[PDB]
Design a protein around this ligand. Sequence first.
Ligand SMILES: Nc1nc2c(ncn2[C@@H]2O[C@H](COP(=O)(O)OP(=O)(O)O)[C@@H](O)[C@H]2O)c(=O)[nH]1
Ligand code: ALF
Ligand SMILES: [Mg+2]
Lengths: 161, 314
Amino acid sequence: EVRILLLGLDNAGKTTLLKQLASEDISHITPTQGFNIKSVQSQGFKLNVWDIGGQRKIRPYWRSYFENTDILIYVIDSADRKRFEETGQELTELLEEEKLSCVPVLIFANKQDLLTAAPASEIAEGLNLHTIRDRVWQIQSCSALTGEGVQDGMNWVCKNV
Amino acid sequence: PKDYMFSGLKDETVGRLPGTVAGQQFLIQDCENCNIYIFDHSATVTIDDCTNCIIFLGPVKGSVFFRNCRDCKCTLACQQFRVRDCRKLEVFLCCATQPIIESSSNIKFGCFQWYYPELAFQFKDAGLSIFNNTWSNIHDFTPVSGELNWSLLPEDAVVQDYVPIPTTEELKAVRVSTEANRSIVPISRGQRQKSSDESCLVVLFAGDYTIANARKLIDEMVGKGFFLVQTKEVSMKAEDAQRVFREKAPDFLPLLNKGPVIALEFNGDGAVEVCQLIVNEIFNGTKMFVSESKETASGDVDSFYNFADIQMGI
Ligand SMILES: Nc1nc2c(ncn2[C@@H]2O[C@H](COP(=O)(O)OP(=O)(O)O)[C@@H](O)[C@H]2O)c(=O)[nH]1
Ligand code: ALF
Ligand SMILES: [Mg+2]
């Protein structure tokens, strides 16, 4: 009933998040070559999550998934500051896409358990998220590995269905 | 606050002793002509814009990611291995999942081959099994028709010639062996071409002496001229045991909840008979599955990987 598209750069933690949501084993995850799908129950809703590979090479394929998307979840590796510019560019381009107009976006600031992890507030400032005015959005700090913060993000999602 | 990074170093030999990283993230960037030895476990490692470096990375719980690197020689263990925009890398790898490259060329792979006293516990702390190693089955996101952007290092390649052990006073406390028979990760052939189409599956069941049993069996089989193709460590449910072992399953059911099983795949003419003969002498009193014949062995191996790939997969 709710179509969630799971996007973000390669190595951001999207599939780790996908398994965390499905309440499944988190400790062994292969890089995604194409895509994964899982259905999860949350707060009376059935969420169909489309988890897409995020390598630069395969980002053109992202558009093939846009149609009928209800919610965008965009995952950022908070501890990969080197690629903050790259993820900002991809997010900016995504939000310009006609097929994703008005679609609520949850930004997960992932890998908060790590040492060099930038706080959500710093990521929101650096990526100028406040200028997003064509849709509702939220940034949520999380660790897909431990699961902490994940539910908090998903509560926002279910609120904005 | 980030003596957890090596940055902008030139013509240096540097490292981290056991205990000094302790599962924290580590970063390497803009290093040229450097020898880097992290003899501890870490959460994740990124290597950016490095040139002519020798790098040892202790067990990495998450991903290792090489970006914009050239002419680097590396030994590392990780959950995921990723490469982008790199050229002429040579890695001795232990990877829990399928290594990937992207927009890269001349990337060569060998099996992880390294020992030091602290290393085994570092693997444990990083949550990495020494038996879950797919180092040779690379996926290239950007292949080029009629050519290959990656290959396997020569089997006779000498580890010391690529990643020499440190000789500095600061790094001397770590007593390293690059000998194949001391390697914490058993040397597996993976996807290398074989002579022989004879396989043999061994399944050992969880317990205090199982790791030692596996190493002894490998040593004995290699000592007789046979090859270790691949290993696995995975939990077996009753249905999985019935699938793989068939009529021999009832003997093994009481042992499945002990913990994950350890599977060995051997290769070579005579492998099944020889493996049976070794097991018959040195493991009497210890239950373990060994393929009954070469005619059923390939089926055993395929059924094992069948269920194992499903359970470990997404
Ligand atoms: N420390 C830590 N590692 C994570 C977290 N989320 C994902 N990872 C690791 O980051 C690597 C990439 O994750 P993956 O789910 O494959 O990324 P994807 O390409 O976006 O699907 C894996 O090694 C994961 O174990 C997290 O919250 N904390
Ligand atoms: F392994 Al990915 F996006 F890099 F799923
Ligand atoms: Mg993925």
